[PDB]
């Protein structure tokens, strides 16, 4: 069958390509699960042919692409594919995901939301589509036919994101879940949600997995809200410090907690170095001023932070 689809990529659009499509309908799972396993490069051009044989100017082509896409997502994260093959698959998906109509895009991104509930993905590689998916929705301000209608591309985009904040994020993939919001443009309300939810999950991770997570949160803030990003990180460790000071008066803990704070700090001082408004937001946040506050403001951690910031030339004098 493969070669006969290679002739269709030669002669002409529509009649050649889409005629052989409607004749199958049986199964796209068994073919791609295998014809990938012989030579992965037989699949690469397989997508290119089938996808241009199913444009979005025809519903039978559109509604077929939706099934195609679904089948390309599962395998990437399911079977063990040479990364070379798995990548190529996703690359082409991201490539051709441009012209999907409003109705189908929502359906596509909603299957990620369903997968987010319970899935062992082993690959956030599925999630690489979400960024481009939502930004495509942002390109259409007109109502789409779904549900009751009365919703723009941006709103579905907003509502889609709100659903992502509500569901449980799997402990394994939350690094990749978060780094997906990093490729999307956000509203100030959407940002505080992505940030806050990510924070909400902090105390549910083993300590040593927090430091790389902070860096991922730090690269979001560049476009986002700094005060909260700083507020959570600081106050998370502030509460974490309190527990350690209480065991000391009532070695074992010291090697982890204080090493992590040394990693977390060193990350946000380097973030302030690449981005200044994050530093000025840190100072304006920690400003003592009223004297009830400097008791509640500075703590061992936030002070270790400032001292560490002394390394940067500009903020040196302001901090002291």
């Amino acid at each position: 069958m493969d070669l006969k689809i290679l002739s269709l990529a030669t002669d002409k659009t529509t009649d050649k390509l889409q005629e052989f499509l409607q004749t199958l309908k049986d199964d796209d799972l068994a073919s791609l699960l295998q014809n990938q396993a012989v030579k992965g490069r037989a699949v690469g051009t397989l997508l290119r042919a089938v996808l241009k044989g199913s444009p979005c100017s025809e519903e039978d082509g559109a509604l077929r692409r939706y099934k195609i896409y679904s089948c390309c997502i599962q395998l990437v994260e399911s079977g063990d594919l040479q990364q070379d093959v798995a990548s190529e698959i996703i690359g082409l998906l991201m490539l051709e995901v441009h012209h999907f109509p409003g109705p189908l895009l929502v359906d596509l991104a909603s299957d990620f939301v369903g997968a987010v509930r319970e899935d062992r993905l082993v690959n956030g590689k599925s999630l690489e589509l979400l960024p481009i998916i939502l930004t495509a929705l942002a390109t259409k301000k007109e109502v789409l036919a779904c549900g009751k209608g009365d919703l723009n591309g941006e709103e579905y985009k907003r509502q889609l994101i709100d659903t992502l904040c509500s569901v449980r994020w799997p402990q394994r993939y939350m690094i990749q879940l978060t780094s997906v919001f990093k490729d999307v443009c956000l509203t100030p309300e959407e940002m505080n949600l992505v940030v806050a939810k990510v924070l909400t999950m902090f105390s549910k991770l083993n300590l040593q997995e927090i430091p790389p997570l902070v860096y991922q949160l730090l690269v979001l803030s560049s476009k986002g809200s700094r005060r909260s990003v700083l507020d959570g990180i600081i106050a998370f460790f502030r509460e974490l410090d309190k527990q350690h000071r209480e065991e000391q008066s009532s070695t074992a803990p010291a090697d982890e907690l204080y090493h992590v704070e040394g990693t977390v700090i060193l990350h946000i001082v380097f973030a302030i170095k690449l981005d200044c408004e994050l530093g000025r937001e840190l100072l304006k946040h920690l400003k003592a001023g009223q004297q009830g506050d400097p008791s509640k403001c500075l703590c061992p951690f936030s002070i270790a932070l400032l001292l560490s910031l002394t390394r940067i030339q500009r903020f040196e004098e302001q901090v002291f």
């Binding site: 070379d84 690449l274 030339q313």
Partner: protein, 723 residues
């Protein structure tokens, strides 16, 4: 104060640099004082790489406690224009990294990464140049801090095409140093962004993927190796194929990766097969002189060499292709030619025989030649004649790139005519420009720029490499003057950018200097001698050769004005260039001392003066001679040379005025007691009002007088504060 005095002697030793770093780190009041002094020292042509070298290699242990200041020096030095200070600011960062503690090497990498992301134009180029050299110096330590370098990726959207190339060059070089065949921190994530970049509709973000991906593949090209690289390259061609902008880029980025890195003949022969077929398919047609389709122009197959058979197959498809695109790939013609051209060359040892018919080709084109009779017949037709002239001009610009290196003498003949056709084309190009104004965007881009008229068209040319300058080997005629200038003008624009562009900057400076000594001197020595004999013995002949005379004296000058000749090593390069200027007579000694070589050259160039057509050509000769002396009587010789320039008869604009001030500045500066030369101007300065408001020893008027007096005064004041 003991250091600032010796600024009057440029040869002061290395210990001065070591001591300035100590004084800098002592107190804050010495900081700002040192800092300015250090800048005025670097702009004094003092404290060069050479000195900072011996300062660090010997003294690193002494300087180990001065580190954070040394790094604070790097900063405030990095923050100025005038790269000379930025370089020295970068040389601090590097010599730090070289011999020093880890914690020191952790901040150096960090400080440099920052200069990259938030820095300015120069700051980012220079920072990425050092970050490259660091891997060369110490790789294993470079990879330990790589987490900071990755952060650069997040700022990719703000960078240029050059730097995107520069940034991926670094990250991938680290990734493959850690382990071959595996995938670690850097490898994966830079694959991640490469995917997310290629899949954007906006070209600005495809530019990032196209360059970054071809660079990765380029570096990992040195069974599992080729399949990885191939899959990476095909993922690029599928993304880039829809837009003629993108695919031309990918073809140029592919054309880069093939000529630079040395890959496996087995990996080269893989991706090479598609290129030969894809090319003949798109752009190549047979000789039917009637092409298919309705073009309201007399479309012929234009300008082959005709030494190539009239009855025969091959002609390029340009017009029928460019017309169909306009109304409803032809922009990928030149990019595809370079790629194919390098593919065959690299699999054949440089034998182009299979493609050689491509240099003999005509193109299917309406007559572009005059717009002169057809003038004032316009709109669509005038934008079509402009870019068709343009597109072709680039074709024969790229073809001269291909066949300049070929051996056979008939093959050098075939290039030399493409050089005249490249000359006529460029005149025809500017004919359409001064005619069709301001409504004329081009259909192609150049150096990726950002998102045309006379000024800009220069930049939309393609790039001639220095191998093309090997055409300069031949002589002249009563290769004529027109083609000579064409090369001489490209050279000068290159040597301004190097010693004072992409493919140029992507080979080392030394190479370009080494080659430009061979390529020019025992050529121009022959070419110069033809210009002199001509100016000793017509409308265009004068105008063109008087220009070739300049471009020569501009180029020769740019070579010996090379500020890297101060270093030990370059003495050998200098010895060559100086002894290649050593033949009016033979060489009695092979090893002759540098000092004589200087004057043998000087004298050789001193007589050239009387032939000089314009006030300019006298200046650039002076400047040339003057740059020889700086290598080592001659001071007075220069005066008489400047005397004559203001004296003998010459055939409104600041040009003339500015060059005068340059001459009078050289005149009064190098001579004997200046009162003597000043009285001459004081006594014969009078004839202005008294005759016919010109003079004996002329060039004195209302506007030419004020120029004199400024140099007159300033020099008197210079000698007054001297004693």
């Amino acid at each position: 104060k003991a250091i600032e005095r010796i600024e009057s002697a440029a040869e002061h030793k290395s210990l001065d640099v070591v001591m300035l770093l100590i004084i800098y780190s002592t107190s804050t009041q010495t900081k700002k004082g040192v800092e300015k002094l250090l800048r005025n020292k670097i702009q004094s042509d003092c404290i060069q790489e050479q000195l900072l070298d011996s300062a660090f290699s010997t003294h690193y242990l002494v300087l180990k406690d001065i580190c954070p200041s040394i790094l604070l020096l790097a900063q405030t030095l990095f923050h100025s224009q005038d790269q000379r200070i930025i370089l020295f600011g970068s040389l601090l960062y590097k010599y730090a990294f070289k011999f020093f503690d880890t914690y020191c090497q952790q901040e150096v990498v960090g400080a440099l990464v920052t200069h990259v992301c938030s820095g300015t134009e120069a700051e980012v180029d220079t920072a990425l140049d050092v970050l490259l050299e660091l891997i060369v110096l110490n790789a294993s330590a470079m990879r330990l801090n790589a987490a900071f370098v990755k952060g650069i990726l997040d700022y990719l959207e703000n960078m240029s095409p050059q730097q995107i190339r520069k940034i991926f060059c670094i990250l991938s070089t680290l990734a493959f140093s850690q382990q071959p065949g595996t995938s670690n921190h850097i490898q994966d994530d830079m694959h991640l962004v490469i995917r997310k970049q290629l899949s954007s509709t906006v070209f600005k973000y495809k530019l990032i993927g196209i360059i970054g991906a071809v660079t990765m593949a380029g570096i990992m090209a040195e069974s599992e190796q080729r399949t990885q690289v191939t899959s990476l390259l095909q993922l690029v061609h599928s993304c880039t194929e829809h837009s003629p902008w993108a695919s031309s880029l990918y073809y140029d980025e592919f054309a880069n990766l093939i000529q630079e890195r040395k890959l496996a003949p087995k990996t080269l022969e893989w991706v090479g097969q598609t290129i030969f077929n894809d090319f003949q398919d798109a752009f190549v047609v047979d000789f039917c002189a009637a092409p298919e389709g309705d073009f309201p122009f007399p479309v012929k197959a234009l300008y082959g060499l005709e030494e190539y058979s009239t009855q025969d197959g091959i002609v390029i498809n340009l017009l029928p292709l460019f017309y169909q695109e306009c109304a409803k790939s032809s922009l990928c013609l030149a990019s595809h030619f370079r790629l194919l051209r390098l593919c065959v060359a690299r699999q054949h040892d440089g034998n182009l025989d299979e493609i050689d018919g491509l240099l003999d080709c005509p193109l299917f084109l309406p007559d572009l030649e005059p717009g002169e009779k057809l003038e004032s017949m316009s709109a669509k037709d005038r934008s079509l004649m402009c870019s068709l002239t343009f597109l072709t001009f680039n074709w024969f610009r790229e073809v001269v790139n291909a066949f300049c290196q070929q051996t056979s003498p008939e093959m050098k003949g075939k290039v030399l005519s493409r050089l005249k056709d490249l000359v006529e084309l460029q005149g025809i190009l500017e004919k359409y420009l001064a005619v069709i104004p301001d409504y004329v965007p081009p259909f192609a881009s150049v150096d990726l720029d950002t998102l045309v008229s006379l000024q800009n068209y220069r930049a939309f040319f393609r790039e001639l490499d220095i191998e093309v300058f090997s055409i300069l080997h031949s002589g002249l005629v009563t290769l004529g003057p027109a083609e000579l200038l064409f090369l001489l003008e490209d050279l000068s624009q290159k040597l301004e950018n190097m010693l004072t562009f992409s493919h140029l900057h992507q080979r080392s400076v030394q190479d370009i200097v080494h080659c430009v000594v061979q390529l020019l001197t025992p050529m121009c020595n022959h070419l110069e001698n033809i210009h002199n004999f001509f100016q000793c013995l017509t409308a265009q002949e004068q105008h063109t050769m008087a220009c070739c005379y300049q471009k020569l004296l501009q180029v020769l000058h740019a070579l010996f004005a090379w500020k890297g000749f101060t270093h030990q090593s370059k003495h050998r390069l200098l010895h060559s260039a100086l002894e290649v200027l050593s033949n009016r007579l033979k060489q009695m000694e092979q090893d002759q001392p540098l000092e004589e070589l200087v004057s043998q050259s000087f004298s050789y160039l001193q007589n050239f003066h009387h032939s000089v057509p314009s006030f300019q050509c006298g200046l650039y000769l002076l400047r040339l001679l003057m740059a020889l002396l700086e290598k080592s009587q001659k001071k007075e010789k220069l005066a008489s040379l400047a005397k004559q320039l203001l004296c003998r008869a010459w055939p409104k604009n600041p040009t003339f005025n500015d060059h005068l001030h340059d001459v009078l500045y050289i005149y009064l500066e190098h001579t004997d007691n200046v009162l003597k030369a000043i009285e001459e101007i004081t006594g014969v300065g009078v004839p202005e009002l008294v005759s016919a408001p010109s003079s004996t020893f002329p060039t004195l008027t209302r506007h030419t007088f004020v120029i004199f007096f400024r140099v007159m005064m300033a020099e008197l004041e210079k000698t007054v504060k001297g004693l």
